[PDB]
Assembly symmetry: D2
Homo-oligomer: 319 residues x 4
């Protein structure tokens, strides 16, 4: 390969720029040339491409978001979209593509290979819900963002002896809520991958009140439901002064943590190695603490799960 492309698609995540930086630096060290695609898939169609020099990626390792931007491109589900895209590609003589993003982004990389455009996917999401990897780029960062909030909430919850329901991100995966809850020392964690009984939850809170703890923290993954409904329920059933906080999009931004920076550097470098060595239609990840690569097709057919033992431990550590 003489020339590759790199794009970010799906919801941005902290560490995407460190990823971009390794793709660009890896490729060039190898003498290959890198072209950035702006606005993700949508930009790819609109032929929104510009070469990236080694310095275009200096001073970005520590920044959140993506300097390549991102957008929702429904028009790419289409053979027409895909054609227009493949055209744009060829028009710049971009031979290969590194896609950094969600799973909606992986599908696109799949479709592109089926049309003979070698693509490698890099998992960038705060969610951790991407098959093929233990951890996605941006998850560690989001986690630290949430525990930052929890730490703060804890101060005021303590002061006023109140119960707080904190809604975190992950529409389909409980990683954020699970790791957060654990690290935060939350009395209750509601994730989608585990059954919960509101009676039990209540029982445990009352019991904790008794054991002398007047404040309490409850984490709820948006996937399960609304922070407001649980707060309402919890308050009606215990009589505790209850407050609800929805973290929101703060979970998406910020300067990536060291782990997210090391992870994104390693994975972005690897994706380039695959393109050169001709492997295409692969997705990178980290499993059992080792750098791996899978067929997108077989990884996409795979499912996202959480360590139920971790979830259990959560319950044993609550007072």
């Amino acid at each position: 390969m003489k020339r590759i492309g790199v794009l970010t698609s799906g919801g941005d995540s902290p560490g995407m720029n460190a990823a971009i930086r390794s793709v660009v630096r890896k490729a060039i060290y190898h003498g290959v040339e890198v072209y950035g695609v702006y606005h993700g898939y949508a930009g790819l169609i609109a032929g929104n491409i510009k070469k990236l020099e080694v310095g275009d990626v200096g001073d970005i390792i520590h920044r959140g978001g993506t300097i390549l931007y991102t957008a929702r491109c429904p028009e790419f589900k289409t053979e027409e979209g895909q054609k227009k895209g493949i055209e744009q590609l060829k028009k710049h003589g971009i031979q290969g593509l590194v896609v950094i993003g969600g799973d909606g982004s992986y599908q696109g990389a799949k479709k592109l290979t089926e049309h003979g455009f070698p693509c490698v996917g890099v998992p960038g999401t705060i969610d951790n819900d991407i098959p093929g990897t233990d951890f996605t780029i941006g998850f560690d960062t989001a986690l630290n963002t949430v525990i930052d909030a929890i730490d703060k909430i804890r101060d005021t919850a303590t002061s006023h002896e109140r119960t707080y329901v904190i809604e975190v991100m992950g529409r389909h995966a409980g990683d954020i809520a699970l790791w957060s809850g654990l690290a935060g020392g939350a009395e209750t964690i509601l994730i989608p991958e585990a059954d919960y009984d509101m009676n039990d939850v209540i029982a445990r809170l009352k019991r904790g009140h008794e054991r002398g703890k007047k404040h309490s923290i409850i984490i709820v993954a948006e996937g399960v439901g609304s922070g407001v409904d649980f707060g309402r329920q919890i308050q009606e059933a215990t009589g505790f002064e209850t407050r609800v906080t929805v973290l929101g999009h703060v979970q998406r931004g910020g300067s990536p943590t060291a782990f997210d920076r090391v992870l994104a550097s390693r994975l972005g470098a690897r994706a380039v190695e695959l393109l050169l060595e001709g492997k295409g239609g692969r997705c990178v990840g980290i499993q059992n603490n080792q750098l791996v690569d899978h067929d997108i097709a077989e990884a996409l057919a795979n499912k996202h799960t959480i360590d139920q033992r971790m979830y259990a431990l959560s319950k044993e550590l609550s007072i």
Copy 2:
């Protein structure tokens, strides 16, 4: 004086512990003895008092919340409440009282002096809405908490080219939203002390879109209204992809900033100086960068205002 008391009332704020620490250390250096009142006014009634040794206040300067707790005590509006309180006081031979808290807390200190219990108020609120001081204890901290959020939001807003409405605290004062907005480089700030015309707001956003900025940040003080209503309005009228974030109680917790720590140390020390020197029914503050003290009565009759010139500047700095 041989023995004083210290309490925290109203919503907790970062820096209350540094305040507690200076009251305790100041007093003892002076050979006076300090008694802590737990759960604020409510605890004062229930005679929830315990002496504080010099070391009871070691390792708290950097902690948020208040180690004395706080509670809402409606029963204190009452002569009966006030009696029960004054009784409890005398029963421990506590001669004077340092009250750290909101204005609801100042009233209580007023009522107590009218019954001959020398009280000095210390402004502790994230709000900055307390007459008699340029700055209250906890405001700087809350500010840094909000800009922390804004910084994050900015990353994702940039990435996806979206408009964000961020709701911050202050039910009656726009300090948080004003300083935040300014420091955050927000395109629009909605505070209660300034008239706004939704048409103009819109005009400025569209105009900014034109000048080439595809993302935008709007700050709204809860006092003005709901982040959701403005978001709805802004989106309907511009067609911009709009998202809303409510910061909530995270604004209340955290390890106080250096300024909040220096401020709370200085003011808590001063309040003790007043008690000893017999001045009672006073409130402390910082005005024109100098340590001052006022009659609670005349400070409570005074009103809270913001620097309108600062608000103006906000508009000139928006692209």
Copy 3:
């Protein structure tokens, strides 16, 4: 005025970019045009100037350092330097100059006015040692950086029951060490503006050891001397397990705090107001919490002092 210039000189400080941003935005709102001077004075000589558009200053409010760079320019002490500079100025038709920086930078602004080039100085230093202002741009930020370190040191000092000597910046002013020490709850603060007796320092440490506190934190402004000498002295005279930490240049970088951002916005805006209204050879500041401006000459003839009462309080708050 139709066209102004802006430069940063002396040691960079967090908040310089927010300053740059207000100068650029203020001026343009006023219809004036802004030219950036790169590498400070040195760049000014080498005619290293480039116009700044409204967007050249978007996304910098939150960044540390200065996008204009800075350098040491000894050659400017010279009439020749000054000529070459004034030439460069005129060659671009830049009529006025906003200088952001230390006092070495103010002198240069003085010399420039004496040659009829209207200049306004903006105080940018982590030091706080600039006459004409209570606070300089970057001081609050440096303070939060130091207390961040102190907080950490406290954890390990506590764990191991050790004494730590922490050297902070300020070669001629004790502001950093004084505010830090206070906010940090340091047992001892050594600043240059106050006499200290090593015997007393020792006495207080031993006494504190006795009162039951096994760890201790000592802050020393580089101006007084080396962290290593004091550590050596303190250890030899108490027998306490002593460790020394030199913070260094970390004090200079980072994303400016809210206060530093609001301060730099307000002051940079003001400096522009002065240039337009013809006032030149002035320096801006904040005194008694109000925006002021002075003649550089009379402010430079003035001296930097610290609130000795604050220093005293430091001693009364130590256990």
Copy 4:
């Protein structure tokens, strides 16, 4: 088992309290009783033990250092020490021991089992240099602390176009410097496990200067040598304006990161599981992202290594 003990020994690390918290909560859930040993081994000798109730470990998950303190106990190398210790143990009827700490701490746990006192070791060090685990408790935290510094240094290094040598901790392992350097986007990393040639280092810096980058960051693990010697060397050989910063003990303190909190919770819980189930003389860890346990003897005979491929990548990512 009816009663266990828990201690912290060696240099404190962020996450030790979260570890303490899981040991205490795990054990009690299991109906076993926990006794804390203060001042590590030294305290164990001096019979400095006190039971720990479920609430003694509330509000510590987020704190750095160790609420159990730690000390250097040379006297424990001794059969006499060990006897005095085993005596103290029995005198409280403490049957098992959870040791959290360095490897110096593991030896002690070994010696204790050889005397029939079932002990389980938990890896707590900022260093990551402990065999039997991919990661030790406190490493992630130290990493984030260093990149925090690097980020700051980068701002000032950029502003002034200078080269900085940053000395980090790890006397025998390069993990900190390696991960830091990578995450920090350092131009050079000097670790002990890899050969370096000062000529090459120089070559790369000059070359980078050429490619247009005027600032540079160099990380050096204390293990390799002094930041001052390298700075001196680098400056003499390039002519670049060079500055040196030694991070020091700040690397040891702070509120543990989410990963350090989850890791310490999981491992501390596991160590208790081993004690109950009779396994003693084991050490816990995380390998290939799975919770494991080893014989202390065979893990101590094993060696600490770094991923050389990671080190390589470091070089390919430098401009």
